[PDB]
């Protein structure tokens, strides 16, 4: 009734980490602020012609 | 822009796979089969063909 447990796949030795969450997006400990998304960069080299 | 390569120029490598990069092949595509033909017969009208 209280905790949403998320399991870390790659745990090193052993631990459990309890955290808090709020109703807003400010109410947290860390912020992941997105910016410009994945960039489809392309090109080619005109001395071997193989793409990149 | 990636390493494929040649099946090492000897029939044993070209058998199934064993390339130089990482494209390891299934195997050469079969084409057909060739065999000797049946030699022809020199008549039999030059002798006797009397049955027994």
Given its phi and psi angles, is residue A22 left (phi above 0), alpha (psi -120 to 50 degrees) or beta?
A: beta
Best CA proximity match to A3, nearest among B51, A16, B34: A16
Best CA proximity match to B24, nearest among B4, B47, B51: B4
> How far, in Å, CA of B36 to CA of B39, rounded?
9
Resolution (Å) of this entry: 3.9
| 8 A C-beta contact, residue B1 and residue A51 | yes
Residues of A within 8 A of B2 (CB-CB) are 50
> Interface of chain B against chain A, CB under 8 Å?
1-2
A44, β-bridge pairs: A51
Query: Nearest-CA residue of chain B relative to A51?
Result: B1
Please tell me if residue A50 touches chain B, with a CB cutoff of 8 Å: yes
| 8 A C-beta contact, residue B12 and residue B27 | no
The technique is cryo-EM
Query: Nearest-CA residue of chain B relative to A45?
Result: B1
């Amino acid at each position: 009734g209280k905790y949403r447990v998320y399991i870390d796949q790659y745990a090193k030795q052993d631990y459990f980490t309890v955290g808090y969450k709020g109703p807003n997006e400010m109410d947290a400990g860390i912020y992941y602020a997105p910016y410009v998304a994945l960039t489809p960069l392309r090109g080619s080299d005109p001395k071997n012609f193989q793409p990149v | 822009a990636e390493i494929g390569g040649d099946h090492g120029y000897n029939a044993t490598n070209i058998a199934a796979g064993q390339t130089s990069g990482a494209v390891t092949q299934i195997g050469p595509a079969v084409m057909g089969m060739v065999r000797r033909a049946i030699p022809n017969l020199i008549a039999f009208d030059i002798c006797g063909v009397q049955p027994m």
